[PDB]
């Protein structure tokens, strides 16, 4: 009878240390004196951060060092915890969507994809084919955008500075497509429950194809500088090595999961949007190290480009927005001409749409790993509880287990191979 039976402490909660079991004695794999062996060694602590690159903006990781090697790594996060999950309870569902742009701020339209897919699942609606392809095309444009940040900032930390500038022109060109569909270079707010906010402009699919014709040459020259370079190879081989069993036990997803030899992509295993309609491959590494995770990320550049070209050729016609004004806003022209449309316009922008009661956990294959949201609905127009599962939050939690015994110059390489934007980690 908790909490009443807990007043006197008549019951003790069975801790995991109660259910510990001795290892089997037979098949089990592997003091004080005048000598200096008994002598102890002092350690000193070091305050690492903030580094120059934008993604690792608020990292205060405190390392304990035995000489040069890392004994224990304690990241202190929360320096960009802004209370998103609470502010989302006082907003309608449409009002809460811009909060998702600002979680992983280098992968915006895939953050708002997982929130739309979660709300759409509770709405029990099927979004039209055109928005399905628009979302899968701009989800791969987003994946290229994030990898341009992640791979090139990683090599900028490792000390290669030129690939960073080349691919940020490629980034500079691919944000023109964000600003044409929406009016934002960073926070589009374009992907919304029921499809997309507005139809793509009438010359964009030609301009993406023109960009497509040359983007592989950009990967090849970026690959000219890093892949076979012995300095690059000797700074990532054997660094940050995680076993396949431990990556699962550590809650690793994405290339952190995939670089240790586990074939697993949410797009292939729980297909969403138009991913079941596109042919693409999944790079899976061997040795579980930073060099494998670099080679897996470069291969995804070429695979995302291969999806974008397929999306251009299968772009169907029709609404880009769920054809129901109780859920998605009516056209401006309808609202200014038809009675029912102005009523549905008015109520969607003041009260919002009601979501039926229930809860759903929805995950997508985000560029930094698996990104998921747990949404409790109360049947009303505001979410009762929004919880974001951020791939980097679980990755930074396993930084101590992975950097243990490494050098600090090794740990800076481990920070970049884990795709870490701290607005994602702190929500």
């Amino acid at each position: 009878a908790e909490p009443q039976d807990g007043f006197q402490g008549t019951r003790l909660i069975p801790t995991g240390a109660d259910f510990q079991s001795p290892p089997d004695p037979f098949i089990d794999e592997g003091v004080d004196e005048d000598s200096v062996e008994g002598r102890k060694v002092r350690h000193y602590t070091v305050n690492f951060g903030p580094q120059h690159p934008a993604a690792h903006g608020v990292l205060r990781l405190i390392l304990e060092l035995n000489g040069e090697e890392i004994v224990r790594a304690d990241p202190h996060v929360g320096l960009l915890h802004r209370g998103t999950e609470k502010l989302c309870e006082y907003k309608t569902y449409m009002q809460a969507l811009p909060y998702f742009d600002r979680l992983d701020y280098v992968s915006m339209m895939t953050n708002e994809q997982v929130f739309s897919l979660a709300v759409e699942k509770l709405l029990n609606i099927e979004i039209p084919p055109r928005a399905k392809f628009i979302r899968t095309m701009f989800g791969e444009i987003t994946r290229i955008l994030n990898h341009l940040m992640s791979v090139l900032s990683h090599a900028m930390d490792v000390g290669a500075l030129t690939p960073f500038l080349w691919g940020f022109e490629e980034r500079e060109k691919l944000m023109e497509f964000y600003e044409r569909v929406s009016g934002a270079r960073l926070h589009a707010a374009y992907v919304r429950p029921g499809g997309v906010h507005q139809d793509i402009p009438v010359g964009l699919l030609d301009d993406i194809y023109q960009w497509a014709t040359q983007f592989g040459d950009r990967i090849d020259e970026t690959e000219e500088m890093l892949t076979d370079n012995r300095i690059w190879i000797n700074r990532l081989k054997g660094v940050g090595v995680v076993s396949a069993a431990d990556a699962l036990n550590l809650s690793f997803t994405g290339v952190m999961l995939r670089g240790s030899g586990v074939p697993w992509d949410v797009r292939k295993s729980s297909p969403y949007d138009a991913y079941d309609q596109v042919e693409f491959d999944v790079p899976v590494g061997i040795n579980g190290d930073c060099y494998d995770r670099y080679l897996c990320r470069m291969e995804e550049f070429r695979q995302s480009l291969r999806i974008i070209h397929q999306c251009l050729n299968k772009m169907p016609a029709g609404p880009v927005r769920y054809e129901d004004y109780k859920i998605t806003p009516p056209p401006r022209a309808a609202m200014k001409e038809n009675m029912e449309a102005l009523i549905h316009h008015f109520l969607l922008f003041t009260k919002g749409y009601a979501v039926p009661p229930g809860d759903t956990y929805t995950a997508i294959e985000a560029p930094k790993g698996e990104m998921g949201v747990y949404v409790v609905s109360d049947g009303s127009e505001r979410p009762y509880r929004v919880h974001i599962r951020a791939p980097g939050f679980a990755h930074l939690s396993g930084f101590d287990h992975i950097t243990r015994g490494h050098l600090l110059a090794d740990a800076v390489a481990v920070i970049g191979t884990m795709d870490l934007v701290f607005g994602e980690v702190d929500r």
Binding site: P3, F7, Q8, G9, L12, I13, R72, D74, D400
Partner: protein, 122 residues
């Protein structure tokens, strides 16, 4: 203390003899540490003022007769001890525990009826 210097695995008091043993060991560590807290955080108070103020924070929960309530009050103490003994709390958090470094000071509720009436509820 495996992951951090002052870490203590979360434990559930077995009975009142155990629960009082832990409280006294918590109080002992805090008042032991008061000289170390007063130099790191440059507290412009006597170590005696720090110790008498540490005592007040235990004196608040002296009448708790629930064993489930003591463990959460003990875990809160242990966590506060860990973030103070590691230089994780800023001087601003620590010397903000002393409720006289407000520009209104310790006197922040009205003293009686009339003085709070003439000041509009303080």
């Amino acid at each position: 203390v495996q992951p951090t210097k002052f870490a203590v695995t979360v434990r559930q008091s077995r009975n009142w003899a155990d629960a009082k043993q832990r409280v006294i060991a918590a109080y002992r560590a805090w008042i032991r540490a008061a000289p170390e807290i007063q130099t790191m955080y440059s507290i412009p108070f006597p170590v005696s003022h720090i110790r008498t103020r540490i005592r007040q924070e235990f004196e608040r929960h002296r009448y708790v007769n629930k064993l489930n309530v003591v463990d959460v009050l003990l875990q809160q103490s242990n966590a506060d001890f860990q973030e103070t003994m590691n230089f994780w709390r800023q001087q601003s958090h620590v010397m903000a525990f002393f409720k006289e470094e407000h520009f209104r000071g310790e006197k922040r509720l009205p003293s009686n009826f009339i003085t709070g009436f003439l000041e509009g509820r303080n």
